[PDB]
Design a protein around this nucleic acid. Sequence first.
DNA 1: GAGAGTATGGCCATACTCTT
DNA 2: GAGAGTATGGCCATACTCTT
Lengths: 189, 189, 481, 481
Amino acid sequence: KLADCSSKSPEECEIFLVEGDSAGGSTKSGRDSRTQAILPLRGKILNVEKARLDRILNNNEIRQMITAFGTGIGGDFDLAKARYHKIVIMTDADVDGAHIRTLLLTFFYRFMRPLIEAGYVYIAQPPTGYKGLGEMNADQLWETTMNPEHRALLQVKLEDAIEADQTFEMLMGDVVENRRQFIEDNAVY
Amino acid sequence: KLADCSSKSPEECEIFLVEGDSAGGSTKSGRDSRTQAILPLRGKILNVEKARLDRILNNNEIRQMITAFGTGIGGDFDLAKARYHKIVIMTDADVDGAHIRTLLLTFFYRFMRPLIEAGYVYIAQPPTYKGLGEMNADQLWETTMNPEHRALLQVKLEDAIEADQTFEMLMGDVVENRRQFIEDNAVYA
Amino acid sequence: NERNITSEMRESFLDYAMSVIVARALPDVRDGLKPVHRRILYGLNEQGMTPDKSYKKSARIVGDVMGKYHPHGDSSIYEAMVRMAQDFSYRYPLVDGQGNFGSMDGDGAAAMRYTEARMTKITLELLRDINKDTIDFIDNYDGNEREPSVLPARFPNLLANGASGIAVGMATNIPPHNLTELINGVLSLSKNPDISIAELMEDIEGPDFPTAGLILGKSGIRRAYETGRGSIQMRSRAVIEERGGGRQRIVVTEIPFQVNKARMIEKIAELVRDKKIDGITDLRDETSLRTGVRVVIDVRKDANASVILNNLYKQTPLQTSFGVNMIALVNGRPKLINLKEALVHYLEHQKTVVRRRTQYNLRKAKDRAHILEGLRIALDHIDEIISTIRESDTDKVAMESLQQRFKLSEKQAQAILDMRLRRLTGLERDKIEAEYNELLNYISELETILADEEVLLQLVRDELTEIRDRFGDDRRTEIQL
Amino acid sequence: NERNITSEMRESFLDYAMSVIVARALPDVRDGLKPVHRRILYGLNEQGMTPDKSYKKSARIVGDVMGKYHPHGDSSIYEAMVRMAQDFSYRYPLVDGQGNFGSMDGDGAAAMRYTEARMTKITLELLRDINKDTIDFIDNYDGNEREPSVLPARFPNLLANGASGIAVGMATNIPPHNLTELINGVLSLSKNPDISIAELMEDIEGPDFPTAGLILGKSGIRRAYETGRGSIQMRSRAVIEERGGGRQRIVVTEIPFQVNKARMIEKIAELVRDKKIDGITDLRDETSLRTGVRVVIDVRKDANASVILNNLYKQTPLQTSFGVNMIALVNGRPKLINLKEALVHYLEHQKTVVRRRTQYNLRKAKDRAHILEGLRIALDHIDEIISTIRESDTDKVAMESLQQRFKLSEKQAQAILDMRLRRLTGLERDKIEAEYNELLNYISELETILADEEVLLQLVRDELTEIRDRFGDDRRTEIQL
DNA sequence: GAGAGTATGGCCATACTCTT
DNA sequence: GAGAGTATGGCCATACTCTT
Ligand SMILES: O=c1c2nccn2c2cc(F)c(-c3ccncc3)cc2n1C1CC1
Ligand SMILES: O=c1c2nccn2c2cc(F)c(-c3ccncc3)cc2n1C1CC1
Ligand SMILES: [Mn+2]
Ligand SMILES: [Mn+2]
Ligand code: NA
């Protein structure tokens, strides 16, 4: 299901991770085929933090991301082999789209950490609202979220490696109590 | 998806052909599991009069029916090996159900003619606008599943030259004969 | 007891064949719709989904249609509705769609969970005057609800949007048309019952596809319009242009009707890959929403680009033929019809609609004039009226007295009893009189129409011409040579 | 700008967890419902699918809930609705379904196209007095509808049907209970607010599963009702019986709550196959509609069958535990609650519901008394009223004259101007007077309730008792010692 | 462990005509 | 060809947590 861009020079390239193939279909119509590519992720992607390693390997979803990024995973990582210099996480601006995002960030931070330091990881900013990504027309996905002239992307950055280590373990970690305590401490009802 | 009775005695066993997997999926809770099997049909059945043998054999739906009956087909067909002495066609009481019925009768008449001649083929008849579907499994069992109230019809073959022509005329790949027949017999009122 | 197999076959096939023929796969010659389409649009009207109102969710739209009128699967309904919303399938779209409703490349529309819809302005013209007893209603499948047997169809929608359907024993394939031309045709026919096809072809040059392109020759047209059947060749719109360095390229901006573009590119790709076609160095889909459709083929240097283009038409869907087979339901029966037939039946539908409409209006108006008279009488004799009601113990008793004392009808009496006290003020009495006078003139005008067939006919001409002016547009398909 | 990854993870994760905790996975303590269930039930109400009305196609039901209140996939909604229609899942079913809605073998229900659904009679008591302003409405997701924040829940529905829900950082598992005992406990609690969990347990004995079975011992119930968390051991109901020839069988007629039967039987067959249990010669599912659940395990001649049974309890879901963890939303946030907080928070909800309803009955009574006082003034002096209206040139003048001359409020004058002429008849006049006299007595009855909190309570007790008598039923699960 | 239960789309068979 | 268009449903992946 990856829909690759026309150009072959990665410096000007962007790839979009799209939640749902309704949001995706739309994005293939809407985008600049020359400089933009679309990869939709079909389901809740595995929590690579909690899960055994081999599960990560037989997984399809994980495999389609590895293939797309063109580097290899963990020890074989080649940031010079990166197929795209921009990686966009584009999910509905709903609580479940927040969840998918946390999972994708977890995968990058454990198996492709070198890309976050590089600075090619971005989080798209769709219009906030009740409407999701799937319910919008192709050309309004473009004018608000994919067009270089009017879009607002946020660059993901790593500002403290031991803090992030502790956070990823606490939020996506096996232990539930640490996660419950964070919620109790920080939840605004 | 085949459901089979506790009995291995083909003399007291009946298999129901239902249009709609969960049209027949209801029945199972309702059907007497001692003497009754259920074979749901997914959709329109390959029209064997128009198809060559490799395609017929390859088709999944056809294979299941052959397997379920167990007699084999054509020259290798063996009557004495029939697993059920009643085969019932349970369709929706509507035109797509009627259309499906002709497809099945075509399959029998061309590939398992002996079965018809024995009198092993029957046509179920449920309640005289709601087909198999939004209907309680107990209700389904009561109207046509139970031997004590149900009204099945036995498919008789009277003239084999006439049947050959009729099947060829109606199910053949020549459209003109079929259109001609429609023009002659259709009555609009 | 027993069911003879040959009997079961002949009876069971005819039900499906007739049902597919008259109740699924073929359009009605009058409104150009098949039942699923008609039920979608009628359902959009009944729900209150007009162009000035909110886009409405598809699932509820589909469910409403399915529950009330179409007892079939939801996917069929949604897919039928989606097509009516695609500007590349419908020359004059009947549904306004919000969300991902597809594209030329054949990527399908989104799930009905993500799309909303409403009528387009032009569909109002299909449903115009439906309530005014212009078309016969029928019971639905379970008998709970009433549905239209045919829509008023105040523009010739069979020919305008075309049809294609596979039935049993026959099929149909009618191409779309330019609305300005069709209406001009209907006007010409209404002035001359003996008009010839050739004469009609002056007004209607041929098909007009939502995807533009070119048609090669009028001879395929002429046979289709004369007989109902004919092969028409559609070409992609393509040119040859320089790209620098002495090299050239083939640029396609339009493709044939009902041709998947993405699929067409693959076939061109394959041809090259299989070395079947000679001289192509690159193939790119430069289509963009801003630029429109743009397919670019890069010819090898010093190769003849015109020859390559011709081979592409020959070995590809770039040039495709449209098989016209104009079959529609006429008096509820499948019939092969030529161009004049199709317009003749349509014009007769419009006459019936307008006539039936004037009659409904006249009946409706007269009833009101009658009720107003009782109000006028009641207001003049009010004092007595009030005491009469007060004297009475029941409505029944009060009603009886009013019919006696003032020679009033039951309806007039009930209207008086239903009158609110605020109708007693000074403005209302003048207001009532003003309305009553208007009706009398209005009734006069309605009766004038009904009396004269020519007067009625002229009105039809007039209402068609307004639709033409408001909705008719430029021809998109060029008819070459 | 850019985004700190640590900041992103905290905000995004907290966003999800909180929504899952407060608007998806956990029930509200007041009505026992999670959002999807509440929306389904409210949706059934609005659609008018009462038990006196016919069954509706499940797809339409779901399409409406999804579009109007729940912007989520159909499977979540349909599957939630199915659960509520299964006697083995809900101790007191909230949904009446027609078609195949599942079985205890884990075979799912039929697709939405093939099933029909409506409220059960008991659900009317969850929805009772919802319109009479008893609970707060909130905007729905797109701003386009209103939905209830909580249902009136005239019967203690969190404890009675239980709940199970996996959230983030916590989860919930509350077992179902017997309604008669639940309400008797609420009644005892109302007469004695310092009552002890022990004391409550003289009414509430333990859980009561739809599937019957046995609970082994009182020791883990007590821990759960006192602390909110405990383990409860469940056993199938099984007997040992002769089958002829000096041979025996084990016969299971009840299985533990939430145990899949088909699975359970396959685990037994597999144990037999792998020689991990000695002595079983046959295994049959003999369950009908008629004869209940009946699983028969035939036992090798002269082998010991109690011993086999005991093993089956060790090695198969035939004995199973239920882990109580009673977390629910209390004032919009998750809280572990014991049996008393559950009942306290319910009983306080019922006092609010009943007070708010009486107040709203008052307000619209007093409102209507006011309008009837106007109409009675008009009827007492009808001749002057008519004259005043006829002398005025506009409704606004007539309004102001009526208010001035007879000391009527704006509302009263408007009502009089809207009054029809037929209300002047003897019977219609008598009706206005009769409604007024009944309404003064009603208003008096309502004020009695709101002057006195003990009356207001006693009314809660009475209404609960009425519900208990009509819907309370026998306990199914046996608590053994 | 285990499986309870709310959340996160796509794929794909057939009948039927005609044709380029 | 195989595709134009209205008709007749199964099967998968995952996240999250718990019985003192
Ligand atoms: O919404 C659903 C859904 N409802 C019922 C079952 N599924 C799914 C089953 C599924 F097996 C999958 C799925 C399968 C394979 N890979 C990813 C998702 C997805 C489902 N989804 C959406 C995420 C798409
Ligand atoms: O109702 C549908 C349907 N709506 C949209 C797509 N499909 C189907 C697609 C399908 F591919 C199949 C199908 C799949 C496998 N074997 C037979 C039919 C069935 C569909 N059905 C059932 C009525 C038959
Ligand atoms: Mn979403
Ligand atoms: Mn049907
Ligand atoms: Na061609």
